[PDB]
Design a protein around this ligand. Structure first.
Ligand SMILES: Cc1ccc(-c2c(C)noc2C)cc1S(=O)(=O)NC1CCCC1
Ligand SMILES: Cc1ccc(-c2c(C)noc2C)cc1S(=O)(=O)NC1CCCC1
Lengths: 114, 112
């Protein structure tokens, strides 16, 4: 990967806002399926993702393009909607964080420049 | 009309609308037709491409982020309502990836 204007933005503007949010705590580290008593979690969710993984990937220059990092955010929220029951609080927490994500993504620099 | 909404109409909706996986999303979920009596009990804001397109055509949106949320609600409903193993979820995941890909290249400063 590399460093771009868009990836800096996703790191310093989007991720920072999401990270500090009051609903963000369950999303800051990987789902610990053992520590939460969810033996079926990895049977259902084949691609785990979390903001700590995404953050570390931004810090180590893992992404080549902004959309790659955006895909990871989407996977994180998608896993949550897919695995949990519609009425679970975590679902509402993901939706709120996801809306902030889309709002902030709308204001990202238009041309990806290294 | 803003620059961003025209991008969402001409680039994003254009790509998504004509996709081979788009057909289940082109019109509102018809719960009677699809035999899903609990659909509207679980899903409280139904959303679909036909609605989003109609809205883009009739200048309903005041901001790009408002259209983006609709697209997002449409996909989120799908993941929340359906079983993880259903094909519709796969189809939604594929469309949403294109959405995000295109959205990453949208004009940045929403000017009227
Ligand atoms: C502690 C925790 C962390 C992550 C998850 C989680 C995420 C995120 N996505 O799926 C699951 C399951 C669930 C949990 S939890 O143990 O289910 N607790 C939830 C109650 C309401 C908010 C948190
Ligand atoms: C025909 C149809 C249309 C819409 C849905 C749908 C959407 C969109 N979101 O939730 C449901 C349920 C489901 C169906 S369906 O009847 O479940 N058939 C699907 C199987 C794979 C492709 C079509």
């Amino acid at each position: 990967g590399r460093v771009t204007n868009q990836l800096q933005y996703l790191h310093k503007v989007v991720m920072k806002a999401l990270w500090k949010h009051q609903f963000a705590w369950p999303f800051r580290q990987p789902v610990d399926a053992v520590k939460l008593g969810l033996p079926d979690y990895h049977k259902i969710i084949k691609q785990p993702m979390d903001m700590g993984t995404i953050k570390r990937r931004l810090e180590n220059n893992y992404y080549w393009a902004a959309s790659e990092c955006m895909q990871d955010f989407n996977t994180m929220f998608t896993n949550c909607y897919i695995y949990n029951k519609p009425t679970d609080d975590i679902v509402l927490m993901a939706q709120t964080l996801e809306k902030i994500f889309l709002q902030k993504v709308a204001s990202m620099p238009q041309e990806e420049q290294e």
